[PDB]
Design an enzyme around this catalytic site. Structure first.
Site, short mmCIF file in Angstrom:
data_model
loop_
_atom_site.label_atom_id
_atom_site.label_comp_id
_atom_site.label_asym_id
_atom_site.label_seq_id
_atom_site.Cartn_x
_atom_site.Cartn_y
_atom_site.Cartn_z
NE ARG A 1 5.54 -7.92 -0.80
CZ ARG A 1 6.23 -6.89 -0.38
NH1 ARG A 1 7.40 -7.08 0.18
NH2 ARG A 1 5.74 -5.69 -0.50
CG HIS B 1 7.93 -7.50 -4.93
ND1 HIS B 1 8.53 -6.81 -3.88
CD2 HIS B 1 6.60 -7.14 -4.94
CE1 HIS B 1 7.59 -6.09 -3.26
NE2 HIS B 1 6.42 -6.26 -3.89
CG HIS C 1 -2.27 -7.82 -0.01
ND1 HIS C 1 -2.27 -6.46 -0.15
CD2 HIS C 1 -1.03 -8.23 -0.33
CE1 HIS C 1 -1.08 -6.07 -0.54
NE2 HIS C 1 -0.32 -7.12 -0.62
CD1 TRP D 1 -4.28 -6.95 4.01
CD2 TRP D 1 -2.60 -8.45 4.13
NE1 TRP D 1 -3.19 -6.35 3.47
CE2 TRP D 1 -2.13 -7.24 3.51
CE3 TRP D 1 -1.70 -9.54 4.30
CZ2 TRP D 1 -0.79 -7.06 3.12
CZ3 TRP D 1 -0.35 -9.41 3.85
CH2 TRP D 1 0.08 -8.15 3.21
#
Ligand code: HEM
Length: 293
Positions: free
Chosen positions: A47, A51, A174, A190
């Protein structure tokens, strides 16, 4: 309309220097296994790579991975980046051992190393991002909201030059990690295999029985009786018929999903960067397992 960022190899460095950095990240991933209730740092590193690259705007080449700007407080404190401080604190001792690597090269290589060490696809990676000053830090608000629909997702990703297939393939990350209420206002993983990189996100979208519920922050999310969740924007991938086709595709073809993910993730990490003609080829790093380490 467009600022140019030309990749500049860190002086005298070659594949072997970066494989050392990859290894130091991979060995610390293995060592610091307790993080986030034994999920380990793989997910948050993926992540952080995303980002730090996903601020890019194709229109004017602002944001993007090149400048390493997450090290500046405006970006580090973006509410959209809540939680990533853990990835950054993880990379600190790596950067101290290898102070010659640029911040953008480290944040992107953290994501590549994590995906590979979690048995995901090999992700070619190119060096040469160069740190840029504080005033090049992009403003907050370039990263996506989670409460929206497929039309939002599609429009949002056009700014990063990603098409439907690239969008659906990138979302399969995810599978990894979880949402944490205190960071994002959503809670839960998830799927079950959330530190091993697989196509489980598409299998769970199609196969779990999802109920639209409110979580403890009073935000809607889709939940299953297995204890899994999907954000509204994840669920949108099965609401829109174009996205649904591609979800079914990757739920049914693990190799295809790996190959498409590897290209989209490399592109995401390279958006905004001009590679000179005689730049080195992309590196494919060996995992610790491949090296017997
Ligand atoms: C519509 C686009 C996306 C939205 C709205 C979104 C939203 C979110 C949210 C709300 C979280 C939970 C953060 C937390 O609470 O800690 C999260 C986590 C995560 N995201 Fe995304 N995301 C998107 C796309 C992506 C993409 C493209 C990737 C990478 C390819 C990615 C990788 C991850 C990973 C690995 C985590 C887990 C982090 C952890 O466990 O610490 N996401 N995402």
């Amino acid at each position: 309309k467009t600022l140019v960022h030309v990749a500049s190899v860190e002086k005298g460095r070659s594949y072997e220097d970066f494989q050392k950095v990859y290894n130091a990240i991979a060995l610390k991933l293995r060592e610091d296994d307790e993080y986030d209730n034994y999920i380990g740092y793989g997910p948050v590193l993926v992540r952080l790579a995303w980002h730090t690259s996903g601020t890019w705007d194709k229109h004017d080449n602002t944001g993007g991975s090149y400048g390493g700007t997450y090290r500046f407080k405006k970006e580090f404190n973006d509410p959209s980046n809540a939680g990533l401080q853990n990835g950054f604190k993880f990379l600190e001792p790596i950067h101290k051992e290898f102070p010659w690597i640029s911040s953008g090269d480290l944040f992107s290589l953290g994501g590549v190393t994590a995906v590979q060490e979690m048995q995901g696809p090999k992700i070619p990676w190119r060096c040469g991002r160069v740190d840029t000053p504080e005033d090049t830090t992009p403003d907050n608000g370039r990263l996506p909201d989670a409460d929206k629909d497929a039309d939002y997702v599609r429009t949002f990703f056009q700014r990063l030059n990603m098409n439907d297939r690239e969008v659906v393939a990138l979302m399969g990350a995810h599978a990894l990690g979880k949402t944490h209420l205190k960071n994002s206002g959503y809670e839960g993983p998830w799927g079950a295999a959330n530190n091993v990189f697989t196509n489980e996100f598409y299998l769970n979208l199609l196969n779990e029985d999802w109920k639209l519920e409110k979580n403890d922050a009073n935000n809607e999310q889709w939940d299953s009786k297995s204890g899994y969740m999907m954000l509204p924007t994840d669920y949108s991938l099965i609401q829109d018929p174009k996205y649904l086709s591609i979800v079914k595709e990757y739920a049914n073809d693990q190799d295809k999903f790996f190959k498409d993910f590897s290209k989209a993730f490399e592109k995401l990490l390279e958006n905004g960067i001009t590679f000179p003609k005689d730049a080195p080829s992309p590196f494919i790093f060996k995992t610790l397992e491949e090296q017997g380490l």
